[PDB]
Amino acid sequence: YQLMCYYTSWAKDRPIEGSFKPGNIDPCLCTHLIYAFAGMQNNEITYTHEQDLRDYEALNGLKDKNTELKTLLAIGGWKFGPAPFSAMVSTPQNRQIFIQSVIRFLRQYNFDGLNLDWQYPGSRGSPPKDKHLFSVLVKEMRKAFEEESVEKDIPRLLLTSTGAGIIDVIKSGYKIPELSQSLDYIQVMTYDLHDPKDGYTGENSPLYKSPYDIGKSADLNVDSIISYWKDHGAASEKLIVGFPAYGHTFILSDPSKTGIGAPTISTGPPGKYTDESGLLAYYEVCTFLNEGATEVWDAPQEVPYAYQGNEWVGYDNVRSFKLKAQWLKDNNLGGAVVWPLDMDDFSGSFCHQRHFPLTSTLKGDLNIHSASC
Template sequence: MAKLILLTGLVLLLNAQIGSAYVLSCYFTNWGQYRPGLGRYKPDNIDPCLCTHLIYAFAGMTNNEIATIEWNDVTLYQSFNGLKNQNGELKTLLAIGGWNFGTAKFTAMVATPETRQTFINSVIKFLRQYEFDGLDFDWEYPGSRGSTPQDKALFTVLVKEMLAAFEQEAKQVNRPRLMVTAAVAAGLSNIESGYQISELGQYLDYFHVMTYDFHGSWEGYTGENSPLYKGPADTGSNVYFNIDYAMNYWKNNGAPAEKLIVGFPTYGHTFILSNPSNTAVGAPTSGAGPAGPYTRQAGFWAYYEICTFLNNGATQVWDAPQDVPYAYKGNEWLGYDNIKSFQIKAEWLKQNNFGGAMVWSLDLDDFTGTFCNQGKYPLITTLKNALGLQSASCKAPSKPIGPITAPPSSGGGSGSGSSGSGSSSGGSGFCAGKAGGLYPDPSDKNGFYNCVNGRTFLQHCQAGLVFDTSCSCCNWA
């Protein structure tokens, strides 16, 4: 009987470990601090109980050594890694590279055994000094975007040498080994030219597969940012541009399923429809949708900016073949994710035995809970719950997570933000000769002009809010 009880206990323990074995890696961006008003994001805004791994983006490189980029990175590192005091199970990694970093410095660094060793030594010293638990490579991408064909093999060599150095250092200092992970491509051509998949599978702790940006305004037609499956409009190479194909390609070519982490975007891509009456997936477009008032990048909205667009009368459509939504209003079209699509993708991830979810990024979810009326971090919380991640040792902060708590009279609970919708009044000429950006409407405190490539879009803040020129955002009056 005692043996049976012991065995039952062991089975329960194993099940508990298996049940909570998923990874939830969440990226923090060191430029979120520069967003205006309610969009501003710093390590103090992070809920330490939300994710299993936090990844700080980005570090750079100088003379083949890892280096800070922002003036206050060291201060931010301290706050970021201090979150482990509130969650003893939390792991933090430092990501190096990113899209804007390009490939030239990576190519130069991997070129010789000496330059690789210089880099590896600098990484160990840097990570230990600032109390990170590992390094996340974000080389976009080995073997393309100016990177040489031999970089595909040299990337494997680098990762192999780094793991060996991490193992040796861990023994010397009697501390847990530093982790080595990579953010990797989801597009077929970039995967083929960039990675020796089965070899990397032996050395990387995790592959953070960037299963988003499959479609955007650069293509000239509407498309979903992060579709789970291919859609009826997909022809040619577009049949590969979906999560299901990308993740299975990595797995079938030798990456262990438990090391493959599925990418989830907390943002969407926007388009200007060529013909506002054609709103289908694959409809012709004339360019990027207007920039959001907080993220301020044409063709791109954070989830909290998306909620404002939806709350202001956009038509929402469920794209059943691809298991993601889209929305449109006037000539603006948006491909995005919501709670439902995150839930479906998380269930698919579990059914396919992948290692977990990766989120780009913390600062693009509705982290204040002000805009979407779905609580704080609605998308990432959906993932946390779907993956069964509850940390016993975690102490959530008692202060509000967001920088500003909305007053009770928020007018319907959707909070501050621009409508994200607006009529194009290209003929009015307000934006002619003006730099892209947001300008107040002199005749209406609630309105503002969004200038995109000389074209004029008149937009409005939500009721009760005014356009604030000090932050170029909608604020409480």
């Protein structure tokens, strides 16, 4: 199995206590490290901030400590949006410019591959034709990577892409059989499945549906999402399940109604370190628990939730990661990806479960152990 781990560039800018630098990642913890976000300029991949170059150096330097470790550079993300991608895939000229820039960039900075994270071909403004054009881009990129590998007699660069977790988004943006032919891995975004804008409490990454889920909501769970991808042609071994190292917060309409599906008013207040209304890093959830929140296990979905006064949080803990890891193995999947590693309790200071409690759980349960480690 693979255990991929995202490192986000902005994690180092948080208050020192929550600040995380790529060079401080345990080199033996994961099989792949993914640097979250390269930018794009004139249809070419590039850095988002010039200081990112130092990050690349530190991140890839970890490979001297774990010779089997691979690194990937991700481009895109939710905030980036679809527009730059729509323009880049619109013509053969633009795609060639992009593909060649990727090979040059990854080889220059010692990355082993690319992680395409177009948040969404076919939706959010991206026209229907982008479902086909995204597939064309992926096929052309894979071909170029194969050709470069043969010409230089070195291992081929890896090509991966995120895959939506929302069914309607999968339908409008992904030619699954074609994409599965050309991609090495598909990182399925099995997270952010329920959020405050729903009007009721809901889990971030439930394994199974809640008995309260109705209609399309009954598909907002890991099992249903992965089943959809497989039923539509994705190679099971290429599917990498998303494991969130954070939860979502809600303000309860009634502090007496605290279960799944309870009415809510809005997102909860931002955490001290992550500063994002509606979200808390796993380490911030540990603080919430330590300071008195009532913790409950939701067996139907096999994930925890906690509440204090009118604040409710749906998240993932060691037990939910363990159960999902077993399920992943039972379903012959390719592995897991922790999103984002910088929100796990990397210092061990917040949860008292040692360093990287969530990710370490997956390392053990997925039998991750490289020869040089």
